[PDB]
Structure formats: structure tokens, C-alpha cells
């Protein structure tokens, strides 16, 4: 939008909050995922995914202008991270998360 407005991504809940993220996800099926931001203090990011009637919210690291759900990875853009994992289990990046980007919470 104005720049890196990830909000354009169906899985981007943008201003949504964690508890809020869980609200939809909690109601959605396992695998349901999304991303959100609202801490107008730290330009950080985190992905939220539905797992076993529960939601997994993992924070994304930022340093080299790269995005990673784990201190061991790095992507150039959420969309390249999220949409790329659609075919790569999150457990490969996530710590406990054992699934893939099944569907966005916005769906």
C-alpha cells in the first residue's frame, strides 16, 4: 500500500492483535494461519497458525532486512517466507509447529 503494507496479503491481519488472531484462528481449523502487527514501537513481525484447537504465534526476526520465524532462517519478504512454506512444513522453520501454510485466517 504505502510501502511494505503486508496487509495486502490475505494472511496479514495487520492491526489485528495476538488474542484477536487467536479469536479467528481458534474458530478456524488446524493449519489456519495469519500474520499481524500493531506494536507502533518495534517494527517486528510474527506469524500465527492454528494447531490442535490452538494457535502457534512465532515471532519473525529482523536484521539483514530479512524475515525469519527462526533465528536460523531468513527471507527477503514475509510473502516469500509464507508462500514458500506453503510447500515446506513450518517445523522446518518453526520450533514446535509441525504443518504447512494450509489456509489464511482471512479466508
Amino acid at each position: 500500500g504505502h510501502m511494505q503494507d503486508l496487509s495486502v496479503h490475505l494472511w496479514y491481519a495487520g492491526p489485528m492483535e495476538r488474542a484477536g488472531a487467536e479469536s479467528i484462528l481458534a474458530n478456524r481449523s488446524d493449519g489456519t494461519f495469519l500474520v499481524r502487527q500493531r506494536v507502533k514501537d518495534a517494527a517486528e513481525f510474527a506469524i500465527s497458525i492454528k494447531y490442535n484447537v490452538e494457535v502457534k504465534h512465532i515471532k519473525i526476526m529482523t536484521a539483514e532486512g530479512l524475515y525469519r520465524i527462526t533465528e536460523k532462517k531468513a527471507f527477503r519478504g514475509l510473502t516469500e517466507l509464507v508462500e514458500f512454506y506453503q510447500q515446506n512444513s513450518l517445523k522446518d522453520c518453526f520450533k514446535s509447529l509441525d504443518t504447512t501454510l494450509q489456509f489464511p485466517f482471512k479466508e
Binding site: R18, A19, V39, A46, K56, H57, K59, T70, E71
Partner: peptide, 13 residues
Amino acid sequence: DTEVYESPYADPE
């Protein structure tokens, strides 16, 4: 509301 994503898990050195 005033909550967010704490940190499910992280990997140390």
C-alpha cells in the same frame, strides 16, 4: 486486547 505474541520457542547457542 493489550496482549501479543510472547515467544512459543527459540533456539540458543
